[PDB]
C-alpha cells in the first residue's frame, strides 16, 4: 500500500526519517523493502539481521537456497527475492564495505538498483560497519535515484547530523 508517513521531505523524489526500518515496514507495507546484503547474503547482523529476524528467518532460508544453484552477488549488484510479511519484494543491494577494503565508487552502481522501482523503503547503504561516510551515502542517493526512496536511519544523532549537513 505505499502509505508513508512522518518523513522529512530532501529532494522531489527523496525523504528521511528516524526510524528502525522493520517498523517502517510493518507500518507502511511497501512494495518494496531494501536490504543492506552482502555477496552470500549472510543476514546475521545489522540492517539485515533486523530484516530476517522479524520474518522469523524465512529470509535467511530463501536467500540460502538462492546462494546455492546461483551463487554470490557482485558488490555494487542486487537481486529481488520475496519480501515475506514485511513487503511484497525484498531488494537485496550490496554497497560496498570500505572497512573491508571495497571500492567506495560501486556506491553509486548500488543506488542505481533503485531506479527499477518506482517506490521503495531503504536503509543509508554502506553505512554503519560498512564504513561509508553517511553524509557521502546520502549525496550519492540524491544525485543517483530518480524514484521514490523513503529512507529509515535508526539513530537519532546521525539522522540530525544527515540533515543538518544536506540543509547547509
Ligand atoms: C547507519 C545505521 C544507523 C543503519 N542502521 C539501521 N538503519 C535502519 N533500520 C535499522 N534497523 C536496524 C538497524 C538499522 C545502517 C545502515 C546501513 C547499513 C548498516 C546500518 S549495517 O551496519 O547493518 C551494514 C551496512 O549497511
Known amino acids: 500500500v505505499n502509505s508513508f508517513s512522518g518523513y522529512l521531505k530532501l529532494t522531489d523524489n527523496v525523504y528521511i526519517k528516524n526510524a528502525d526500518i522493520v517498523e517502517e515496514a ?4 511497501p512494495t518494496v523493502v531494501v536490504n543492506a546484503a552482502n555477496v552470500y547474503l549472510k543476514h546475521g547482523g545489522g ?4 530484516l530476517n529476524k522479524a520474518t522469523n528467518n524465512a529470509m535467511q532460508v530463501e536467500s540460502d537456497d538462492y546462494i546455492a544453484t546461483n551463487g554470490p552477488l557482485k558488490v555494487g549488484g542486487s537481486c529481488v527475492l520475496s519480501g515475506h510479511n514485511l513487503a511484497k519484494h525484498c ?12 571500492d567506495i565508487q560501486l556506491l553509486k552502481s548500488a543506488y542505481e538498483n533503485f531506479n527499477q522501482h518506482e517506490v521503495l523503503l531503504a536503509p543509508l547503504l554502506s553505512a554503519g560497519i560498512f564504513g561509508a561516510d553517511p553524509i557521502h551515502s546520502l549525496r550519492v542517493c540524491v544525485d543517483t535515484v530518480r524514484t521514490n526512496v523513503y529512507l529509515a536511519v535508526f539513530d537519532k544523532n546521525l539522522y540530525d547530523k544527515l540533515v543538518s549537513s544536506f540543509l547547509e
Open 91 to 102: 531488494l537485496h543491494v550490496v554497497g560496498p564495505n570500505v572497512n573491508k577494503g571495497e
Open 47 to 50: 540492517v539485515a539481521g533486523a
Open 26 to 29: 510493518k507500518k507502511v507495507k
